[PDB]
């Protein structure tokens, strides 16, 4: 099993921590969702290849510009996370995270991940965003951002309902294996 490194990046409340917990545990925690994710090594079999995928998070490092890059050494795939209920977090994808990731991790594939897709039909989400002259991030808006930033691909998931969670990590494993 070849060893590959995955790192998730994104604004404070974009669901980057939930996404790792839900995948490593294989379920949305029924009793207590932990606050922090330490690390985890996933045994993934994608398209016939056996890979050992190390999982890392940058939660807590967002305000510390010298400390955060210490997470980047040897990354083989980057999950660029944004939240679908937060159009403002999508604005910081090409103006904040994309220049930094391309500086410390050049040529490393990036997958733009639209988190919290379940919130597209949540009534409270559409009401709160309307008192801002806004609405949930649309699938075509996500694709267009993934296009402009030269992301290897665009994917949507929901850590709450586990929908699309497996497909992101299987795809990230495929991306990491690429020449």
């Amino acid at each position: 099993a070849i060893r590959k490194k995955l790192v998730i990046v994104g604004d404070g409340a974009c669901g980057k921590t939930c996404l790792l917990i839900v995948f490593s545990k294989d379920q949305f925690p029924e009793v207590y969702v932990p606050t922090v994710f330490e690390n985890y090594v996933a045994d993934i079999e994608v398209d016939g290849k056996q890979v050992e995928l190390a999982l890392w998070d940058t939660a807590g490092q967002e305000d510390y510009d010298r400390l955060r890059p210490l997470s980047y050494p040897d990354t083989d795939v980057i999950l660029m996370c944004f939240s679908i209920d937060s159009p403002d977090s999508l604005e910081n994808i090409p103006e904040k995270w994309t220049p930094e990731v391309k500086h410390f991790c050049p040529n490393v594939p990036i997958i733009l991940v639209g988190n919290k897709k379940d919130l597209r039909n949540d009534e409270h989400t559409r009401r709160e965003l309307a008192k801002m002259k806004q609405e949930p991030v649309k699938p075509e808006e996500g694709r267009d951002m993934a296009n402009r930033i030269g992301a290897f691909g665009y994917m949507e998931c929901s850590a709450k309902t586990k929908d699309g969670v497996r497909e992101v990590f299987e795809m990230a494993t495929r991306a990491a294996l690429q020449a």
């Binding site: 009793v31 606050t35 922090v36 330490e38 510390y64 400390l67």
Partner: protein, 235 residues
């Protein structure tokens, strides 16, 4: 880690650790407040266990088996003994605060009413200065440690077999030399997230909410000082 502590923290939360009959006697807010405190101690136990792997298993293992040049092992495991003392003393205090909180006749039923004071002492004065200077040095030597490990693995045959040997157990899956180094660097950035979630469910006692607010500020000041004093090194 010692079996006693491992069992006390083997559950996925405080609600699952204490006896269901004891849990059923508390307000839902207390269960949430204790769940996050249980995680602060659970992750502190794992942090100290990571440091023991680096000191006894890797660092000491190379000194007693390999013929490495003097100073290579220090470049590979910077400030590990200093970090180990800092956190083992924090873990000691956290664990005694839980043992004191246990009600008579049980070893698993507890409610930690005061925590803020312990966090204020750990993240202030000499203890805070000692972590600041320690983590500033650790993080500046972090890249150099990773490159040095990779050079030794890609050139030395004996070092290669030592690493394959010690990391073979199933328990060391996510705890190799490089994972241990990043695990320690990321650790300091966990505290504000944990203290903020504890603070959110600690409004019952006003002097506790203020203690946790002072502690939250103290940790953010520490992380800022460490971030300012970082100067990456290269071999």
């Amino acid at each position: 880690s010692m079996e006693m502590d491992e069992k006390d923290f083997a559950a996925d939360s405080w609600s699952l650790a204490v006896d269901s009959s004891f849990l059923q006697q508390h307000k839902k807010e207390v269960m949430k407040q204790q769940d996050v405190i249980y995680e602060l101690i659970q992750t502190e136990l794992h942090h100290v266990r990571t440091l023991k792997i680096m000191t006894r298993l890797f660092r000491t293992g190379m000194l007693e088996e390999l013929h490495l040049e003097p100073g290579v092992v220090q470049g590979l495991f910077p400030c590990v003994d200093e970090l180990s003392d800092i956190h083992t003393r924090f873990l000691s205090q956290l664990l005694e605060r839980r043992r004191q909180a246990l009600c008579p006749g049980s070893t698993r039923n507890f409610v930690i009413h005061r925590l803020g004071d312990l966090l204020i002492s750990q993240f202030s004065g000499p203890s805070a200065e000692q972590m600041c200077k320690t983590y500033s040095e650790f993080c500046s030597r972090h890249s150099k440690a990773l490159k040095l490990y990779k050079e030794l693995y890609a050139r030395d045959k004996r070092f290669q077999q030592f690493i394959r040997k010690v990391t073979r157990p199933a328990v060391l899956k996510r705890h190799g030399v490089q994972e241990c180094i990043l695990l320690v660097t990321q650790r300091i950035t966990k505290y504000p997230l944990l203290i903020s979630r504890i603070l959110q469910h600690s409004h019952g006692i006003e002097e506790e909410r203020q203690d946790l607010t002072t502690a939250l500020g103290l940790v953010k000041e520490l992380l800022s000082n460490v971030d300012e004093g970082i100067y990456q090194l290269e071999k």
